[PDB]
């Protein structure tokens, strides 16, 4: 059965036009236009967004597309076609000062999402409820991957690394009161600014995790200057703490922030560092060269972790790698092109 006919059967009516938007590794995203102009998004697979959209359908203020239909073999998923300005487009045209209010609004909306859904997290399907347990399991194996990669970079872990890693694993496996619904893959392309507030798209990586896992969006993943990341985390925390008493505790929140940032640094180091060491032309994402990106990630982790009171073997090992790669690479830490104007170098 042709895809167009499959979609028509799914929706109960034939779209006048099916426009491919994004080809992902797992799914094609399609905008389907009805004869009257109305549109929906269909994702075609050739797997928990559907369950996430169902789970969030009563969350207010609305933050996600409503689920519309899923085929019997689950290969086609239809959801609302939410429109707005992507955060990616906003960051390309705004100044730091001009981006602060929408970024604070996003951070606030995410804190309310995490806080409102923390008492509800057991209603997720079992595979999604268990996500933090699976990632903590994988954290154990990540130690050896990190040690081997550091060796290829010429750097040995500082004394006490393994004991400090065991503490990281234990923290990563005990989100406790911070356990909540997380989107899992927040990025400038899947956050919208709309006239009715922020919206989130692309829930493929939804799982039950520490609330702070999603905060890595601006604390560790997208290279926001600290002049924006700090007010975002403060606005996020005020919203989360309105729901969650544990977030009102300065030391508990700081510890959770530090755990997830430390995990993020060492986990994402394994993605492309070997490629960066080899030195071929490469990008972290389009517009952001790979060596400036890792130098940013190294500097941002060391500096912000130190501010959060980190002073152990994991920080010292990151410091040693930073010093090596700064000497070895002629490149400097930098920001992406077309990103909040002319930023002072990090």
């Amino acid at each position: 059965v042709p895809l167009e006919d499959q979609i028509g059967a799914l929706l109960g009516e034939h779209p006048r036009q099916i426009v491919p938007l994004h080809a992902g590794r797992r799914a094609q995203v399609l905008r389907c236009h009805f004869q009257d102009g109305h549109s929906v998004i269909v994702k075609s697979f050739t797997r928990g967004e559907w369950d996430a959209l169902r789970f969030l359908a009563a969350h207010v203020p609305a933050i996600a597309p409503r689920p519309l239909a899923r085929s019997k073999d689950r290969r086609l998923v239809a959801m609302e076609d939410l429109r707005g300005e992507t955060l990616a487009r906003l960051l390309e045209r705004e100044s730091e000062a001009g981006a602060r209010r929408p970024l604070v609004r996003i951070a606030d909306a995410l804190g309310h999402l995490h806080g409102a859904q923390a008492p509800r997290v057991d209603g997720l399907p079992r595979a999604l409820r268990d996500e933090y347990r699976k990632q903590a399991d994988e954290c154990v194996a990540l130690r050896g991957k990190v040690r081997a990669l550091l060796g290829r970079a010429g750097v040995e872990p500082t004394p006490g690394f393994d004991g400090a890693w065991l503490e990281l694993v234990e923290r990563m496996g005990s989100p406790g009161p911070f356990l909540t619904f997380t989107h899992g893959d927040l990025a400038p392309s899947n956050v919208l600014l709309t006239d009715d507030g922020p919206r989130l798209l692309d829930f493929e990586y939804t799982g039950a995790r520490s609330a702070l896992y999603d905060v890595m969006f601006w604390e560790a993943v997208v290279p926001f200057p600290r002049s924006l990341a700090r007010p975002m985390t403060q606005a996020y925390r005020r919203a989360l703490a309105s729901h969650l008493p544990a977030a009102r505790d300065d030391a508990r929140f700081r510890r959770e922030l530090l755990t997830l940032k430390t995990h993020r640094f060492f986990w994402w180091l394994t993605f492309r560092l070997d490629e960066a060491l080899a030195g071929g032309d490469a990008h972290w994402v389009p517009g952001w060269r790979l060596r400036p990106a890792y130098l940013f990630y190294l500097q941002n982790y060391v500096s912000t972790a130190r501010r959060l009171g980190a002073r152990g073997p994991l920080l010292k090992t990151a410091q040693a790698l930073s010093s090596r790669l700064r000497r070895g690479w002629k490149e400097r830490a930098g920001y992406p092109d077309h990103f909040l104007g002319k930023l002072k170098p990090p």
């Binding site: 590794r25 692309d202 969006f217 993943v221 997208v222 993605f271 492309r272 972290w284 994402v285």
Partner: peptide, 9 residues
């Protein structure tokens, strides 16, 4: 992934 990609294998 898809603000970053892991070289999975």
């Amino acid at each position: 992934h898809x603000f970053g990609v892991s070289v999975l294998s």
